[PDB]
Design a protein around this ligand. Structure first.
Ligand SMILES: CCCCCCCCCCCCCCCCC(=O)O[C@@H](COC(=O)CCCCCCCCCCCCCCC)COP(=O)(O)O[C@H]1[C@H](O)[C@@H](O)[C@H](O)[C@@H](O)[C@@H]1O
Ligand SMILES: CCCCCCCCCCCCCCCCC(=O)O[C@@H](COC(=O)CCCCCCCCCCCCCCC)COP(=O)(O)O[C@H]1[C@H](O)[C@@H](O)[C@H](O)[C@@H](O)[C@@H]1O
Ligand SMILES: CCCCCCCCCCCCCCCCCC(=O)OC[C@H](COP(=O)(O)OCCN)OC(=O)CCCCCCCCCCCCCCCCC
Ligand SMILES: CCCCCCCCCCCCCCCCCC(=O)OC[C@H](COP(=O)(O)OCCN)OC(=O)CCCCCCCCCCCCCCCCC
Ligand SMILES: CCCCCCCCCCCCCCCCCC(=O)OC[C@H](COP(=O)(O)OCCN)OC(=O)CCCCCCCCCCCCCCCCC
Ligand SMILES: CCCCCCCCCCCCCCCCCC(=O)OC[C@H](COP(=O)(O)OCCN)OC(=O)CCCCCCCCCCCCCCCCC
Ligand SMILES: [N+]
Ligand SMILES: [N+]
Lengths: 309, 131, 305, 133
């Protein structure tokens, strides 16, 4: 086992997952009453309706699926994509390892992205509709998929932040940006969920996920050598500008012109109604800060685009 | 390891910190939304009601009224008498956002028992509650 | 100027002392309404009675007299004690440094004990009456003397603890021992006031001060070579035995018995009635921990014997 | 720095001094949480008979605060409007509860229910004042 544990780092998390899942299903009840339902499923379903509330068990779901992604992270590394990079014959320790970091970015950005769209497609937020972000606020309970999405992203980015802080590998020169990306992404995921801004945050998360998918895919081919690298990078600027700037600006503008006019705007702590004149500067500052960071990144992409030409 | 533990602990404290803010504000909301207003009548007797916006609902006024009744008077120093008179003419949510409020949804007359007779006059037909 | 501020370290806190007194006295208010009253005098007096409540102005009084005790400490050493050592012909500079704190210790406990027994005498706590420690509990207000004593005593030990914390002279063999004593006395002073146990803390503190006074007087006579040292130290063992052990043990027994019999023993947070079955172990172990220290310290005195 | 070590103790100490002053204040304004146990006696779908139990420290004020605390927390007027009454037991003093378990009648009982059972709360209140939330 120990020899397998080292060579196949995913073994240890894999054992936990199969045990807990087996124990949960072997219990028979497989319902909210199961202590293992605390972890393997999302809790606080509103009776039998498709809406789940928030509470302590959410962290149990997040913590357990940090282990799940730890397996998936390491499993896809050892069994799937690392052989692929050898199949591509990168033949470079640093170049290959970085190409792994980006290849894994394809798997999860290429899954969560389409998942966020599938969630948002099955919602009234379709096509970044900013009015629905606020009409139903506070959204104290979430559909099955949005809770799966938010906690799944919280579970995913918690694991990524967890491994990053462990520093299992010697930090690279860009380690600071990775820390900021993970800590800021976690903070946005957690703040939006805890403060019932899930509808607003799903749109913002989709933009940050979808653009990243093309970033890593574009970057992956740059590590490689193909005629598709400029084509995908060209696709990336279109999606980056549209999603990180056009969509996020429209979301920013709504925080100034639909935070007030859509839904309730009177602060009411009794009813968890935090959308008010006090939260507007905070939401605007947070989203604007994200856009300011995006503009800085846009500067990089634009100067790296001139270097491309 | 330990560094991660610290990151997890501080993050979980932030989670718990925000949770209590949501819980405490949701539970003590009348503190943020209902401003207690006093009208000293005579001796220890006062007229007591809460003012505020839409979030200062009848429940919030009652909680705000009860808070000062049960905090501005010490029964263990001297026994007190009070009455809380509901305003049948307003709904539980009556207070508007702006400052031109109407009649309060709840009013209370509370005074130490040396002033008991006075509270009864101001309470009129309303039940007298003793603490 | 800095030369005088160095040769006379008591210049530094005499300025604020003179300013506040002169500023306080010159102003025509001189009552609780004046801004400086919360620093210069006892606050929270109720009516014309002698009983004073507690509150934050008791922290502005402590802090202000921490300056006074920082003036009183350095002034007396830099005016009377240090010349006293020089005029006594002490042959060792290290001994001179040690006799500074004891000679100051003889002073401050030598006036604190007399003040403390004065407070107890002018109180129904006289003869170390354990009944009075509990019949009137909680004691939310204190006589003028009591509040001056405790808030003055907490100021005094807070400055002594502070000076030790900033390590004016780092090297000291018993620095850890002093740091513990200074912290403990400032915890028992605070805890007993804030929890309305001033009456029970007064005798415990008086035993500490009266014994400390003769310990210091004996110790100085040890440094100051004299035959009187042993006779004075003999009076210390008997005084230490009676005060640190007989009185404190009696207080411990009252904690076991009279803490549950006299006064209200029903917990009531509404009335701050903390004398109950929960505070009993806390009060016992705190005094018991104090006694165990005195038991250890008695063994050291017997070792000296 | 030595001066830094001074401020960290003067910060740790003042923290301690305030933690205790918050403890002695917080417990004194929230004394009914320590001394009064809310005893809920369900009567119908939303109506419950509500009173508090405790020792002598469970004042009549403590019961009223305890009963109000539950009326205003166990029922959400924004989900559905709330009806209740508080009935004083004028046959006992404000300090009535013994230390032991044979408490006797409470100093305050409240019948509280959502407006769906308002007619039913009215019946149990028995001509007491009916309060709406
Ligand atoms: C937990 C809270 C427990 C409550 C018990 C103690 C209260 C603590 C003190 C809070 C300080 C607020 C002072 C203003 C009170 C007020 O007063 O609350 C205010 C402001 O809220 C506000 O700052 C609360 C703070 C909000 C901060 C947001 C931070 C975002 C998340 C933070 C989480 C971080 C975790 C922190 C961990 C705890 C409510 O405004 P409102 O009553 O609607 O306005 C009315 C009406 O509109 C009407 O017009 C009236 O006529 C008019 O007079 C007005 O009164
Ligand atoms: C130097 C010393 C420095 C010390 C500084 C602090 C010292 C105090 C530490 C002890 C504190 C414990 C409190 C006493 C427990 C009690 O308060 O004990 C309570 C129960 O507390 C319960 O809730 C559980 C305790 C919960 C945790 C303890 C404290 C919680 C947080 C405290 C911080 C407060 C901050 C803000 C508060 C809102 C007993 O109530 P009681 O009157 O005895 O009544 C009983 C009843 O049980 C019975 O029904 C009656 O019939 C009968 O009369 C009985 O007598
Ligand atoms: C990168 C993405 C990789 C792929 C991610 C998605 C994979 C899905 C499968 C993963 C393994 C778990 C499989 C199922 C475990 C047990 C689930 C279960 O019991 O049923 C679903 C559960 C509740 O269902 P039930 O108990 O039936 O109650 C509701 C109906 N009565 O409720 C649940 O559905 C709980 C379990 C959900 C499992 C997935 C949660 C995370 C997915 C989030 C999206 C992807 C996150 C990636 C982030 C990268 C982007 C930066
Ligand atoms: C960075 C490394 C990893 C760090 C952690 C992972 C990052 C997390 C990212 C965000 C993911 C979700 C986090 C939030 C989930 C739980 C908090 C929550 O939403 O609580 C809300 C709930 C109240 O529900 P609500 O609908 O808001 O109003 C009342 C309902 N009528 O609240 C409540 O009623 C309960 C409040 C809970 C208070 C406790 C706070 C947490 C303390 C630690 C508990 C740990 C035990 C459980 C988890 C085990 C695994 C760690
Ligand atoms: C020995 C060290 C260890 C400690 C042992 C315990 C004893 C010492 C305690 C600390 C020093 C004294 C602190 C408190 C003294 C002042 C108390 C006070 O409130 O002053 C009363 C005085 C009269 O006016 P007042 O009573 O305020 O007005 C009527 C309403 N009460 O109020 C006023 O109007 C005047 C304001 C007060 C001015 C005080 C001036 C003090 C000058 C030096 C005092 C020295 C104390 C020690 C004695 C030996 C010194 C060598
Ligand atoms: C260096 C000192 C500080 C200098 C700056 C002065 C301002 C500091 C402000 C920050 C700290 C504030 C802490 C909280 C203050 C207390 C608040 C208050 O008003 O509490 C009330 C309480 C009395 O309660 P009571 O009125 O009897 O009860 C109600 C009626 N039943 O009141 C009390 O019981 C509180 C009594 C406080 C005084 C304690 C006396 C002993 C002090 C021991 C010495 C501490 C020295 C610390 C620094 C050196 C440490 C080595
Ligand atoms: N307020
Ligand atoms: N309790």
């Amino acid at each position: 086992y120990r020899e397998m544990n080292y060579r196949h780092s995913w073994l240890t998390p894999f054992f936990i997952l199969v045990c807990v899942y087996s124990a949960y299903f072997l219990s028979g009840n497989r319902t909210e009453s199961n202590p293992l339902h605390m972890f393997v499923a999302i809790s606080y379903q509103v009776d039998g309706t498709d809406s789940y509330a928030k509470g302590i068990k959410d962290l149990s779901f997040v913590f357990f699926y940090m282990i799940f992604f730890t397996f998936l992270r390491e499993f896809l590394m050892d069994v799937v994509i690392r052989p692929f990079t050898v199949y591509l014959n990168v033949t470079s320790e640093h170049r290959q390892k970085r190409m792994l970091e980006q290849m894994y970015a394809i798997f999860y950005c290429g899954v969560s992205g389409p998942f966020g769209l599938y969630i948002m497609y099955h919602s009234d937020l379709w096509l970044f509709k900013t009015k629905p972000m606020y009409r139903t606020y506070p959204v104290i309970t979430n559909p099955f998929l949005f809770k799966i999405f938010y906690l799944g992203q919280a579970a995913f980015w918690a694991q990524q932040a967890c491994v990053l802080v462990l520093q299992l590998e010697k930090p690279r020169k860009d380690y600071k940006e990775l820390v900021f990306h993970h800590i800021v992404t976690l903070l946005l995921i957690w703040s939006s969920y805890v403060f019932h801004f899930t509808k607003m945050g799903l749109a913002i998360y989709i933009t940050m996920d979808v653009s990243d998918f093309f970033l890593s895919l574009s970057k992956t081919l740059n590590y490689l050598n193909s005629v598709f690298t400029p084509f995908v990078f060209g696709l990336f600027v279109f999606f980056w500008i549209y999603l990180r700037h056009v969509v996020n600006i429209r979301i920013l503008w709504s925080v100034l012109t639909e935070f007030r006019h859509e839904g309730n705007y009177v602060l009411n702590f009794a009813t968890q109604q935090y959308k008010c004149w006090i939260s507007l500067p905070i939401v605007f500052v947070l989203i604007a800060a994200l856009q300011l960071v995006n503009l800085y990144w846009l500067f990089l992409i634009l100067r790296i685009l001139y270097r491309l030409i | 390891i330990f560094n991660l533990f610290r990151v997890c602990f501080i993050s979980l404290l932030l989670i718990a910190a925000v949770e209590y803010f949501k819980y405490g504000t949701r539970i003590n909301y009348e503190w943020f939304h209902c401003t207690p207003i006093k009208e000293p009548q005579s001796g220890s007797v006062i007229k007591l009601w809460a003012r505020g916006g839409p979030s200062c609902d009848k429940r919030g006024e009652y909680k705000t009224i009860v808070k000062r009744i049960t905090r501005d008077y010490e029964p263990n120093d001297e026994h007190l008498s009070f009455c809380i008179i509901e305003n049948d003419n307003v709904p539980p949510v009556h207070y508007p956002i702006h400052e031109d409020k109407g009649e309060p949804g709840y009013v209370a007359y509370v005074g130490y028992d040396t002033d008991s007779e006075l509270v009864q006059e101001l309470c009129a037909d309303s039940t007298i509650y003793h603490m | 100027f800095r030369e005088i501020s160095y040769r006379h370290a008591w210049i530094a806190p005499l300025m604020i002392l003179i300013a506040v007194y002169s500023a306080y006295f010159t102003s025509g208010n001189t009552t609780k309404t004046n801004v400086l009253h919360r620093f210069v005098a006892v606050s929270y007096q109720i009516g014309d009675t002698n009983a004073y409540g507690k509150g934050i102005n008791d922290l502005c009084f402590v802090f202000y007299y921490m300056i006074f005790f920082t003036f009183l400490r350095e002034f007396l050493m830099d005016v009377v004690i240090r010349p006293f050592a020089i005029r006594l012909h002490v042959t060792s500079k290290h001994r001179i440094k040690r006799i500074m704190e004891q000679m100051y210790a003889i002073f401050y406990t030598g006036v604190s004990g007399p003040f403390g027994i004065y407070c107890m005498y002018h109180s129904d706590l006289w003869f170390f009456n354990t009944k009075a420690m509990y019949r009137t509990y909680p004691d939310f207000t204190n006589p003028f003397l009591f509040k001056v004593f405790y808030l003055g005593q907490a100021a005094f030990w807070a400055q002594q603890a502070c000076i030790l914390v900033l390590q004016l002279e780092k090297p000291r063999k018993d620095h850890n021992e002093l740091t513990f004593h200074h912290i403990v006395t400032l915890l028992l002073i605070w805890s007993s006031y804030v929890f309305h146990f001033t009456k029970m803390g007064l005798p415990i503190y008086i035993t500490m001060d009266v014994s400390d006074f003769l310990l210091s007087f004996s110790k100085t006579l040890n440094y100051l070579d004299s035959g009187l040292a042993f006779f004075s130290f003999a009076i210390f063992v008997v005084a230490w035995i009676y005060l640190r052990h007989y009185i404190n043990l009696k207080i411990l027994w009252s904690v076991l018995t009279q803490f549950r019999t006299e006064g209200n023993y029903v917990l009531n947070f509404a009335t701050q009635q903390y004398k109950c079955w929960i505070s009993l172990p806390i009060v016992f172990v705190l005094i018991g921990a104090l006694q165990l220290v005195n038991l250890y310290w008695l063994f050291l005195i017997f070792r000296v014997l």
